[PDB]
Structure 1
Amino acid sequence: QGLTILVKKEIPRSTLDSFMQPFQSTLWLLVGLSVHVVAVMLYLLDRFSTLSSAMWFSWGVLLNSGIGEGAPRSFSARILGMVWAGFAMIIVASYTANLAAFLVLDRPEERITGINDPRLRNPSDKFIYATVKQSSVDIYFRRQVELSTMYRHMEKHNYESAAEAIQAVRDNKLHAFIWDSAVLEFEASQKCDLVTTGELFFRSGFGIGMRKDSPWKQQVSLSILKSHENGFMEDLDKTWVRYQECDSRSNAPATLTCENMAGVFMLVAGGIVAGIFLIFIEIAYK
């Protein structure tokens, strides 16, 4: 067995403020200004040789719903409508382009890569290590003084027993909890909130203890070498470490949710409210 860094993984959910995210809140304004410009300017600039026959026209070509009537009868309005539509397409093209350059290039922060990188060679005081006090891994640490930058932080956060120092990672009280291998690679294999990074550094080996030159040295040292080639230990492996309940956790990139899409529903509500409060006015004028 060996030693590996346990790390709690997070359930991914990407953040969008509202549907109008990728537009600075000034751009919609001049887009509306331009639509009114070309619409009304077309109406007049064809009336020389149908007001709503320009209003609805250029207020519908943008929203891609061929509602109502209107057409360029003169040679005037034809070219202007014909390029107005091209603009109305280029906008709805680049909007999708820029949302796709966002909802793909925003993954969470890169996971920890073990004790190789400088990201841990200085513990920034936000996220924290731990191990069990008077362990064997602290014994490995102290006799390598270079990680005194690390060792110091662990001098104040270690825990009494591994069960507590792992239960306290499932409550966001502590990010990492270093230990060996054959108590991690079992632990994550029950629930869905723990995951390793696998990288090995301490190729140790467990063993049995007994005082020096007891009457039992050679007999045990033999009767273990038996039970690794007649399958006994393999059957023990299968029977007692009931392995698989979890899976690959294949990085589902943020299917959206209700509160991440509330903006459009305020739009449709602003539409509905216009109903009974525009059935009064333009019928009182009737």
Structure 2
Amino acid sequence: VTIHQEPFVYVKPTMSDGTCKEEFTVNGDPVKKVICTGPNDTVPQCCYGFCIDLLIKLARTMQFTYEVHLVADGKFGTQERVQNSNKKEWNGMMGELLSGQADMIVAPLTINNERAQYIEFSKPFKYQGLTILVKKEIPRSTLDSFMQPFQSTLWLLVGLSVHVVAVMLYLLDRFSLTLSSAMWFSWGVLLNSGIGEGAPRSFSARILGMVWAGFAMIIVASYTANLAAFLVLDRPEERITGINDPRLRNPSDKFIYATVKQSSVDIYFRRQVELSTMYRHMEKHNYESAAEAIQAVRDNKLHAFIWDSAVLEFEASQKCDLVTTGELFFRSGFGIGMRKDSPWKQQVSLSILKSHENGFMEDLDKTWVRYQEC
């Protein structure tokens, strides 16, 4: 059993009757699918994913008929405190393993030091980690630039200044057309467009030529400077510091930053000391549904979210506006259910050994990881 996770798997309601969409890959591989039962919020629906696929291959080594069940609760699982009687409550699918309700429940909820002495685990299927779900802003900053963000009024200002300039040249004319050949001339000094009529040979005339010359020269130069301004530019602080993130480290109501309700990652945050900040704030802020995190970012609902990092990296494709976190936070891993003892134990370990040893993992990157759009 597991919870619907798009980066992990693609599981939708079944197509018609015992039916799902039958499609080969974009590479033409006909990725298998299977059906597990669950309520919409308790009946069979369609389930597929490169992870669950890895489960399929796992059986393909050591043969056991693969029964597809879904999760009941929303969380993965944790030994947790009940409301009364002071008895250890192992939650989620983990609890279902305490319930033994399945064989080995596949899931990427990383191995927990808490869950450790409770439940067995194997080596990481996909070495991964957790981090803060973030959505990037939309860079634009553009304009008509030389038109728009260059000398708004001033371009015109020097514009008429050219009229007074040609005026000055006409003053230089009469001390030995004057309006018109200037209307071509100094206007050309603006354009440098080569009308080709001419320029006066008066001693002051060509000097003024050097004058408006350097003028417009530095003017177009300034246009280039504006080009850099469009090109080189601030793109201001993206935050995303890390476990040391001051905004995080500086609790206030402004930024809304949290993770899933009853999260093994938030469990890594659970036993802690310095983490007490979000352990208070984000706790009250914690949503249960990481899907509601995907949409919440699509909603720009919070100022921040947190979940399985690799998962988000995959979701980064699903969101053009997403913001990847800075670095890794407390890397760990998960996989199929491991508890009590099974002949599937050392065997399954060897299955992993083939997995990373072979490329069917790296192959499955095409099935999931290598698949990328954004």
| Alignment TM-score, normalising by the size of structure 1 | 0.65
1:197 aligned onto 2:325: yes
Report the Cα offset of residue 27 of structure 1.
3.3
SS at match of 1:129: coil
In terms of fraction of residues, the more strand-rich structure is 2
1:119 aligned onto 2:237: no
Quick one: distance in 2 between partners of 1:42 and 1:234? Answer: 76
Deviations 1:160-216 (A, max 9, x none): 222222232222223432122453344335554545336223233426667768999
Quick one: distance in 2 between partners of 1:59 and 1:158? Answer: 66
Report the Cα offset of residue 65 of structure 1.
2.4
State which of 304, 315, 319 in structure 2 corresponds to 1:187: 315
Q: Aligned in 2, Cα 1:58/1:151: closer, same or farther, shift over 3 Å?
A: same
Contact 1:130/1:157, CA 8 A, preserved across alignment: yes
Q: Aligned in 2, Cα 1:61/1:7: closer, same or farther, shift over 3 Å?
A: same
Q: Aligned in 2, Cα 1:126/1:15: closer, same or farther, shift over 3 Å?
A: farther
Contact 1:12/1:108, CA 8 A, preserved across alignment: no
Deviations 1:50-77 (A, max 9, x none): 3322343112221222337453143342
The answer for the alignment partner of 2:266 in structure 1 is 138
Instruction: Give unmatched runs, 5+ long, in structure 2.
Output: 1-127
State which of 225, 231, 252 in structure 1 corresponds to 2:353: 225
The answer for the alignment partner of 1:7 in structure 2 is 134
Q: Aligned in 2, Cα 1:160/1:96: closer, same or farther, shift over 3 Å?
A: same
Deviations 1:241-280 (A, max 9, x none): 6744xxxxxxxxxxxxxxxxxxxxxxxxxxxxxxxxxxxx
**Structural RMSD (CA):** 3.8
More displaced stretch, 183-192 vs 230-239 = 230-239
Q: Aligned in 2, Cα 1:28/1:224: closer, same or farther, shift over 3 Å?
A: closer
Quick one: distance in 1 between partners of 2:227 and 2:206? Answer: 32
Quick one: distance in 1 between partners of 2:305 and 2:275? Answer: 16
| Higher RCO (CA < 8 A, seq sep 6+) | 1
Q: Aligned in 2, Cα 1:227/1:76: closer, same or farther, shift over 3 Å?
A: closer
SS at match of 2:329: coil
Quick one: distance in 2 between partners of 1:70 and 1:7? Answer: 62
Q: Aligned in 2, Cα 1:124/1:23: closer, same or farther, shift over 3 Å?
A: farther
Quick one: distance in 2 between partners of 1:235 and 1:57? Answer: 70
Contact 1:130/1:165, CA 8 A, preserved across alignment: no
Quick one: distance in 1 between partners of 2:259 and 2:208? Answer: 72
Report the Cα offset of residue 123 of structure 1.
4.4
More displaced stretch, 164-173 vs 220-229 = 220-229
The answer for the alignment partner of 2:195 in structure 1 is 67
More displaced stretch, 184-193 vs 43-52 = 184-193
Percent identity, aligned pairs only? 100
Contact 1:22/1:95, CA 8 A, preserved across alignment: no
Quick one: distance in 1 between partners of 2:360 and 2:153? Answer: 73
Quick one: distance in 1 between partners of 2:358 and 2:144? Answer: 62
Quick one: distance in 1 between partners of 2:270 and 2:335? Answer: 23
Deviations 1:75-106 (A, max 9, x none): 34233234322222222222322442443123
Q: Aligned in 2, Cα 1:119/1:44: closer, same or farther, shift over 3 Å?
A: same
Contact 1:122/1:150, CA 8 A, preserved across alignment: no
Report the Cα offset of residue 121 of structure 1.
1.4
Contact 2:258/2:282, CA 8 A, preserved across alignment: yes
Contact 2:249/2:277, CA 8 A, preserved across alignment: yes
Contact 2:129/2:331, CA 8 A, preserved across alignment: yes
Contact 2:146/2:223, CA 8 A, preserved across alignment: no
Q: Aligned in 2, Cα 1:203/1:75: closer, same or farther, shift over 3 Å?
A: closer
Report the Cα offset of residue 232 of structure 1.
7.7
Q: Aligned in 2, Cα 1:126/1:63: closer, same or farther, shift over 3 Å?
A: farther
Q: Aligned in 2, Cα 1:32/1:165: closer, same or farther, shift over 3 Å?
A: closer
Contact 1:9/1:194, CA 8 A, preserved across alignment: yes
Contact 2:145/2:226, CA 8 A, preserved across alignment: no
Deviations 1:100-138 (A, max 9, x none): 244312325435243233243124544321222122233
Quick one: distance in 2 between partners of 1:54 and 1:90? Answer: 21
| Alignment TM-score, normalising by the size of structure 2 | 0.52
Q: Aligned in 2, Cα 1:223/1:104: closer, same or farther, shift over 3 Å?
A: closer
Q: Aligned in 2, Cα 1:203/1:17: closer, same or farther, shift over 3 Å?
A: same
